[PDB]
Design a protein around this ligand. Structure first.
Ligand SMILES: CNCc1ccc(O)cc1
Lengths: 300, 237
């Protein structure tokens, strides 16, 4: 189990860690989160009591270093930092536990939700989408735009998701105009799986990262990216059977975890109705289809 | 964006553009089989591609052989249309390639947009107008060349005959759409009106009769009266 200490909590803020979150009052003695399960990526995120715009946060993996949070009153936000002095870090963490000023990552032992949401997410791939190689953790917020969005302005702050475009040079073979547009098995398997992602786990990883960014920050271009990668699979007639079964699990926990009051902006009617009911793969998403009908029969 | 009543006059500026109408590409008769089941038989069709400014028509004849052994023909028809429009643009010199292609039916957007992927500076546009270009097979010389074809064939016509010697493109397109509107609403009457006077003939190299300016006015009035009447009959007004 690992720890992320906080120097202080000078401004009222709602702190999230993965799918959990806590309300912290202005200058309440708060000094970190403990018992964070080692072995997965994690996201610690913030929404100030005063500005319910701009959700922001940091992707990190505790194995890659000792990380902590500290409020910056010039830039006005909680920043993640790395402590390289391992001794000085065990010391702060111990003294803060001793004083019991830390919340415990509140995992139920029965609950695999976070594992299911993050099965294929790797810190190494995150740092290629969020390029900032001087830090081992990755910052994301509500307002960041994606590379594809920018193409249609500051690239340093860009989500370098893999660009997917059904009416592109990349999407269609010369002479297979109709075949490939109706049956994207070529965009999916040859150009994306074997070409760019190399395997389905990296593909699934970016898909899962995109969803989490849309859920935790309402990042609109991540939502676009998540739907695009769902649609590419669902619109391919030929998909490895292992991918289909894992996709149904992936989508199931994502739908299960979504706050009910957000389905309106987070779920694209067209893609889902096409995936669940019109696509080649209508029959391959039994669990995702059952939970969608019993929870959001409206959108359908 | 979409072409509509407001941006209508853009058709007659000097940006090259083509209308594409796919309505007559896949044409069937529907009959009964020995066992009493219904079956279709395809007849020859055409892509109707027209430059509204110059009257040049690129009538691409779709021979029934192109459907042989193919499923989901109505969907395939839209892709074949795009495939042939694509090839037509790619056959033309650069300075004759259109800057826009306006499709009379929105289902053509995606097929044309994919066949034209590599042609990113040609804009594919839908339209809100109710253009009567389906009636093109009511023009005898066009229906004739389509039904006689024995192989895929491109036949070129000027759909305005020689009108532009004397009237504007705007006026020429308005005459064309009025004539086709009438032929669509009541072909038999429309055709009666055009041929009634045996002394007005159609030149071998023309599609329509050699009316004088005055006789076109009478004709156009008669085609307007036809159209209004049929509407009252349709709706009881
Ligand atoms: C020639 N039809 C457009 C097109 C589609 C795909 C492609 O790789 C190149 C060109």
């Amino acid at each position: 189990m690992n720890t992320v200490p906080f120097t202080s909590a000078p401004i009222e803020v709602t702190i999230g860690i993965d799918q959990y979150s806590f309300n912290v009052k202005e200058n309440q003695p708060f000094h970190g989160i403990k018992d964070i399960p080692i072995g997965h990526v994690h996201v610690i995120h913030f929404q100030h009591a005063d500005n319910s715009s701009m959700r922001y946060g940091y992707w990190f993996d505790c194995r890659m270093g000792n990380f902590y949070i500290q409020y910056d009153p010039k830039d006005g936000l909680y920043k993640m930092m790395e402590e390289r002095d391992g001794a000085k870090f065990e010391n702060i963490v111990h003294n803060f536990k001793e004083r019991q000023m830390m919340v415990s990552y509140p995992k139920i032992d029965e609950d695999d939700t976070w594992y299911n949401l993050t099965e294929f997410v790797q810190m190494d791939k995150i740092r290629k989408i969020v390029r900032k190689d001087e830090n081992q953790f990755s910052y994301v917020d509500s307002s960041m735009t994606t590379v594809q969005e920018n193409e249609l302005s500051d690239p340093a702050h860009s989500l370098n998701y893999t660009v997917i475009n059904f009416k592109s040079r990349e999407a269609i073979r010369p002479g297979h105009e109709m075949e490939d547009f109706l049956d994207k098995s070529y965009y999916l398997n040859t150009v994306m799986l074997q070409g760019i992602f190399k395997n389905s786990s990296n593909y699934f990883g970016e898909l899962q990262f995109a969803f989490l960014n849309a859920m935790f920050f309402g990042n609109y271009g991540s939502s676009l990216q998540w739907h695009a990668m769902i649609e590419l699979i669902c619109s391919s007639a030929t998909v490895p059977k292992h991918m289909l079964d894992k996709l149904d699990e992936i989508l199931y926990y994502q739908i299960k975890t979504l706050p009910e009051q957000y389905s309106d902006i987070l779920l694209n009617e067209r893609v889902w109705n096409i995936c669940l009911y019109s696509s080649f793969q209508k029959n391959s998403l039994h669990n995702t289809e059952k939970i969608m009908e019993n929870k959001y029969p409206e959108l359908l | 964006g979409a072409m509509n009543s407001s941006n209508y006059a853009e058709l007659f500026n000097n940006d090259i553009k083509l209308f594409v109408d796919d309505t007559n590409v896949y044409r069937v008769t529907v009959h009964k089989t020995f066992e009493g089941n219904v079956a279709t038989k395809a007849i020859n069709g055409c892509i109707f591609t027209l430059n509204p400014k110059t009257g040049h028509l690129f009538l691409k004849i779709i021979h029934t052989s192109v459907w042989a052994g193919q499923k989901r023909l109505s969907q395939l028809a839209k892709w074949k249309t795009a495939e042939e429009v694509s090839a037509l643009v790619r056959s033309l010199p650069k300075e004759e390639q259109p800057k826009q292609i306006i499709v009379t039916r929105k289902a053509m957007l995606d097929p044309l947009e994919v066949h034209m992927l590599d042609f990113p500076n040609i804009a594919i546009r839908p339209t809100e107008l109710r253009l009567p270009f389906s009636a093109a097979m009511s023009i005898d010389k066009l229906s004739d060349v389509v039904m006689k074809a024995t192989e895929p064939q491109m036949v070129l016509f000027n759909i305005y005959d020689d009108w532009l010697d004397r009237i504007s493109s705007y006026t020429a397109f308005s005459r064309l759409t009025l004539l086709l509107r009438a032929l669509k609403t009541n072909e038999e009457s429309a055709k009666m009106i055009l041929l009634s006077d045996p002394t007005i003939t159609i030149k071998s190299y023309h599609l329509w009769p050699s009316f004088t300016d005055e006789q076109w006015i009478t004709i156009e009035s008669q085609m307007r009266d036809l159209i209004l009447t049929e509407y009252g009959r349709k709706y009881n007004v």
